[PDB]
Design a protein around this nucleic acid. Structure first.
Lengths: 52, 62, 50, 99, 174, 126
RNA sequence: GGGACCGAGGACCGCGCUCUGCAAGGAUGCUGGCGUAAUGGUCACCAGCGACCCGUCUUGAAACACGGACCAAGGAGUCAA
RNA sequence: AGCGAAUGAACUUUAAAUAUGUAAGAAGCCCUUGUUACUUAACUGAACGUGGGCAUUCGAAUGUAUCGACACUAGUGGGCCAUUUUUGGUAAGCAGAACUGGCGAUGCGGGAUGAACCGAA
């Protein structure tokens, strides 16, 4: 009888996708990356970047 | 699961009897065996699965 | 529920795979060319006159 | 995701029915393995084997005029400062404006 | 024009059996966004070599930014612009903080002084003048003149545009 | 050349012989023959109306008409499909019978070793 | 967080959820003044904006030309083979 | 583009832009042998048939607010403007074909105004 927007109505969102509760509770939209030291950019890359 | 991707099937009433049909549908989708209107090729997926199992692409022991 | 959880996992894994492939190519000194996009949204915003 | 969730209408027996139920998604696309809105979104975004059927089932999304205007001269190509053509990743911003 | 950034593009002819591992052409350009950058790269490559968009691909597009956007630099731009008579060369100088700002000012100045447009202007070579004695234009010379200090006479005060009526006559001294 | 009835024929229109000169609209067209005479051949062609399409009949002699190979491509595709499906049935593996519309390219890496990119100015000065 | 417009239906069923219940297949609860020209509607005028005099005829179209002082009654595809 | 490939728009390994005709399956191809008054030196070819082969991706995409056949019935047979292509000519005008687009029977926003403009029914 009405089309309720699931992006505004949490209940329609839960009805359509039961994983919304787990998404919100586990903060799957705020997942950090791995914890490793990133290697430096190569000097060849820097020289090609500023070749001209 | 890892070797065939195949998102988990719906178990439905009972176990296995229709889980095999869902496995056939998912394997057909993953391999690319479809129909005229996009109907999944369950029997071609089954044939591919049994051929791969005979060739040894699937592990298993007693 | 299970299918949606694995869909979310697959989306995140694909994003990280793209990022990691670009970074490893950059580190090895090559250039990684991403696969061309397979999906297009098209909007008809112009009238039908002439 | 937002195009399916907010403006998603299916062609059920030639009628524009809002996608309010995983059930109706299942009757219309169950023989393809698509049984929920998440499955439809997956099949559309990750272009799957049955993308043709999923897109045909989806009624063409009726968008509104963008919130914020198009551009001062919208009838030339996007690569000369217009709006027409292939805006590669900027159509996401256009969809934000048009929703 | 617009807001610009450095875009360095490598693109190559699509590999074939006849000539695998092609030349991998590269060039740096100024575009408001990556789509325009790739379009301009392909247009320039079509103009120079016999490589087209269909028979080519974009290996890489990266944003070159300034090494030091906080120190004042003098830039010399050699450009070619086509007017009703033909193609003409100009060397012009700009005192900015970035090559992006130099190119922005150059488009603005060419439009103001010669009515030359984006597709009528070609950027052939933009360089940073490593030291004085490399500046040839009197305006930037007077800008780099020793112990440069000047007043700002007749400074019109910044009054709100909704302040229709004032009670005192404004002053233009400070 | 020997031409029978029912085949598909291309018209070239050369300037060697002025007899039986066809129009420029009929120049460089393709059609199916319906009448065969001693020298001229009756060809049915599709003409474009200002809003529709119609069928017209013309008489073009031997010096302009030649057989085509569109049906040759169709028939060779049929033969290839039959042979490939028989081989697939023999080997117990599935094969793609249809032809694909040439999907986009995938991701790959291009090395820079001994292939240093060359910088190109917008116009070449030498 | 603030604002605007809207409230279609009329026992229950259905999808659901955070399940003593609920924002879950369309508005209920509380309170005030008035209970009459108060709301509302119709005429006359003013104000803001909009707005060529109808029909016929010709032509691709206009323009031209023709008919129109006003009102009442009558007034033109019917019957037979 | 090259002629550090040959030869010399009329040269070519390759090949632009630009519109454009035909065909894309059971409404199928073959292969195999029975007949025929056709034909051939001949059971030899052609036609008429049998058997097989794929019903599941049955042989590209995308759309599909159904398509085809027969019968009967009313109003229509004018053109004007413009883009692109093209033939001819003048001092300049301009004239003629082809496609497509606006007007008819079309109201609305803009261009102060307005058949031929822009947006949009």
């Amino acid at each position: 009888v009405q089309k309720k927007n699931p992006l505004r109505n949490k209940q329609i969102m839960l009805r359509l996708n039961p994983y919304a509760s787990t998404f919100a509770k586990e903060k799957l939209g705020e997942v950090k990356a791995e914890e490793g030291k990133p290697p430096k950019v190569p000097a060849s890359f820097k020289e090609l970047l500023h070749e001209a | 699961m890892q070797v065939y991707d195949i998102p988990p099937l719906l178990k439905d009433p009972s176990q296995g009897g229709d889980a095999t049909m869902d496995f056939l549908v998912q394997v057909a989708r993953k391999r690319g065996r479809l129909g005229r209107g996009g109907v999944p090729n369950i029997q071609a997926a089954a044939m591919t699965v049994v051929t791969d199992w005979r060739d040894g692409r699937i592990q298993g022991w007693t | 529920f299970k299918r949606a959880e694995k869909y979310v996992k697959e989306y995140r894994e694909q994003e990280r795979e793209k990022i990691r492939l670009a970074r490893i190519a950059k580190q090895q000194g090559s250039f990684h060319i991403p696969a061309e996009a397979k999906l297009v949204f098209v909007i008809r915003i112009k009238g039908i006159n002439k | 995701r937002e195009l399916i969730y907010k403006r998603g209408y299916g062609k059920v027996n030639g009628q524009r029915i809002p996608l309010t139920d995983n059930a109706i998604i299942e009757e219309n696309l169950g023989k393809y393995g698509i049984i929920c809105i998440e499955d439809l979104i997956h099949e559309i975004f990750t272009v799957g084997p049955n993308f043709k059927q999923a897109a045909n089932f989806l009624w063409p999304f009726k968008l509104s005029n963008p919130n914020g205007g198009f551009r001062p001269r919208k009838f030339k190509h996007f690569i000369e400062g217009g709006d027409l053509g292939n805006r590669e990743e900027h159509i996401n911003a256009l969809i934000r404006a048009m929703n | 024009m617009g807001r610009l950034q450095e875009y360095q593009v490598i693109g190559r002819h699509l590999p074939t059996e006849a000539n695998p591992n092609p030349a991998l052409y590269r060039m740096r350009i100024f575009a408001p966004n990556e789509v325009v950058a790739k379009s301009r790269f392909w247009y320039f490559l079509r103009g120079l070599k016999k490589v087209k968009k269909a028979t080519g691909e974009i290996v890489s597009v990266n944003v070159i930014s300034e090494k030091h956007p906080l120190k004042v630099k003098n830039f010399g731009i050699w450009l070619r612009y086509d007017s009703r008579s033909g193609t003409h060369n100009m060397y012009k100088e700009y005192r900015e903080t970035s090559r992006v700002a130099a190119v922005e000012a150059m488009y603005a100045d060419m439009a103001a002084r010669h009515r030359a447009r984006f597709r009528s202007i070609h950027i052939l070579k933009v360089v940073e003048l490593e030291k004085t004695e490399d500046v040839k234009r009197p305006y930037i010379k007077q800008l780099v003149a020793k112990n440069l200090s000047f007043p700002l006479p007749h400074r019109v005060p910044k009054i709100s545009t909704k302040k229709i009526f004032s009670a005192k006559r404004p002053s233009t001294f400070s | 050349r020997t031409y029978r009835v029912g085949d598909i024929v291309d018209i070239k229109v050369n300037g060697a012989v002025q007899k039986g000169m066809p129009h420029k609209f009929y120049h460089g067209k393709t059609g199916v023959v319906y009448n065969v005479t001693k020298s001229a051949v009756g060809v049915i062609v599709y003409k474009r109306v200002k809003h529709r399409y119609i069928e017209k009949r013309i008489n073009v002699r031997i010096e302009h008409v030649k057989p085509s190979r569109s049906r040759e491509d169709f028939l060779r595709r049929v033969k290839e499909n039959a042979e490939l499906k028989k081989k697939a049935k023999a080997e117990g593996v599935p094969v793609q019978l249809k032809r694909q519309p040439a999907m986009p390219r995938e991701a790959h890496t291009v090395s820079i070793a001994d292939n240093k990119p060359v910088t190109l100015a917008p116009v070449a000065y030498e």
